[PDB]
């Protein structure tokens, strides 16, 4: 069993009040069953899409989860992941400089 | 430059009820162009790039028939492999298959590959010459003897050295506007003060295609890896890619450090400096 | 286009 790697990031450099896309990239996991949610101030975002399942040279899986969003000064964004390897969901906060 | 066509197939058994979950994707280089998903209502191979949409009804009928046949091969294999490994009927298990062809800059055959895994570990694969097999354990060795008697390597080689290359060349021509375009990285540097005495420099590469890139830090013209961090290459979501590399430096000494960017879309490598 | 030959099980 391999635990997911997680990156949370915007498509375009973040500027407060300007329309954008929020990404959660999960990779390096096995088996393929996984739960991924995008959060705004701790609440699940409803209109989230994902890529078609594929895998890397080492047979580990990867997926991109994504939604339209408008960042602000005060609003907090995060990605929440559950997998058979995790005893509870893992929450990674969006850092606009990473 | 060189080009590839690659297909990826995943099946996951559902022991409580019904047939395995089956997902197929096809790529030219770093561009996805088709999918099949057993859970979707269409039960068709579907387009995922604009340049494949011009293929006529005979294309979509044939690809749908063949991808369904691949899913039935996986279903039988999941039952066989449970037996070879003496496993119970209670657990979910996985098979993964990848195959395809590379061409050189001349668009002529360079190499082919065909690889299979059970529960995320190597099972059986063609060797580089496409004329013999690598079997990881004694279950896969019984499969190797069966496929030697049935001349399976010769049947796969005919596709990988022939048909596979003909289709890749058709797609490269039809999709020229994007598949033959290189998008060089859009680069910049940011600065973040940790304390009054140490700072982080972050070298960004954005909106590039293809995904292959190298970012390197130098101090006074010598490679530095200590006090550095580099994230894995990640998708932007619009078909392009992103990466960054960072170094921690004494505040006031930023000018000693250079970030070096190598990519297919750059005639010469780029050097950035704060 | 996908493999266009005869398929074989393990």
Residue numbers in the entry:
A (entry chain B): 2 to 99
B (entry chain A): 1 to 274
C (entry chain C): 1 to 10
Sentences from the paper on this structure:
T cell activation is tightly controlled by the clonally expressed T cell receptor (TCR) via direct recognition of its cognate pHLA. In this study, we solved the structure of a newly identified TCR in complex with an HLA-A*02:01 restricted melanoma antigen-A4 (MAGE-A4) peptide (GVYDGREHTV), hereafter referred to as A2-GVY. A2-GVY is a key oncology target because it is expressed by many tumors, including esophageal, head and neck, lung, ovarian, bladder, breast, lymphomas, and melanoma. Site-directed mutagenesis together with structural and biophysical analysis revealed a novel mechanism of TCR-peptide selectivity whereby the CDR1α loop of the TCR could sense the chemical properties of peptide residue 1 via a molecular gateway guided by a conformational change in HLA-A*02:01 residue Trp-167.
Binding affinity measurements of the GVY01 TCR to A2-GVY containing a G1A peptide mutation (the most conservative mutation possible) demonstrated a complete loss of binding. To explore this finding further, we solved the co-complex structure of A2-AVY at 1.35 Å. A superposition of A2-GVY in the GVY01-A2-GVY TCR-pHLA trimolecular complex with the A2-AVY co-complex demonstrated that an Ala in position 1 would result in the CH2 of HLA residue Trp-167 shifting 1.6 Å toward TCR CDR1α loop residue Pro-29, disrupting the indirect interaction between the GVY01 TCR and the peptide through steric hindrance. We reanalyzed the structures of several other peptide-HLA-A*02:01 complexes with different amino acids at peptide residue 1. This analysis revealed that Trp-167 acts as a molecular gateway, altering its angle with respect to the HLAα2 helices, depending on the identity of peptide residue 1. For peptides with Ala at position 1, Trp-167 substantially altered its position to accommodate the slightly larger side chain, representing a second family. For the GVY01_αwtβ1 TCR, a G1A peptide substitution reduced the binding affinity by 115-fold, whereas the GVY01_αwtβ1_P29A mutated TCR bound with only a 7-fold loss in affinity. Full analysis of Ala mutations along the peptide also confirmed these differences, in that, for the GVY01_αwtβ1 TCR, a G1A peptide substitution was the most detrimental to binding, whereas for the GVY01_αwtβ1_P29A TCR, G1A substitution made much less of an impact. These data demonstrate that TCR residue Pro-29 was directly responsible for indirectly sensing the peptide via conformational changes in HLA residue Trp-167.
